[PDB]
Amino acid sequence: YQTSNFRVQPTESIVRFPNITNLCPFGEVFNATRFASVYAWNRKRISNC
């Protein structure tokens, strides 16, 4: 006589993303020798990393 199923799930699940960033040198933008003025604030993008 059918009793029930069993929705097993050992060690839940694993979350995986690719290897570490590539072309994200945040240091030279944030530890830069060259900063900007407040009215002349710079604008540079970070992308694909």
Binding site: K44, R45, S47
Partner: protein, 37 residues
């Protein structure tokens, strides 16, 4: 102006270089391949 998304990669007419381009979701995706024929 706006390229912050910059990217860097008798012989019988021995070549075939096709750059056929299609758009999905509005945002452009290049599709291409160079077949030496």
């Amino acid at each position: 102006n706006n390229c912050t998304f910059e990217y860097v990669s008798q012989g019988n007419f021995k070549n075939l270089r096709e750059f056929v381009f299609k758009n999905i979701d509005g945002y452009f995706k290049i599709y291409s391949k160079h077949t030496p024929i």
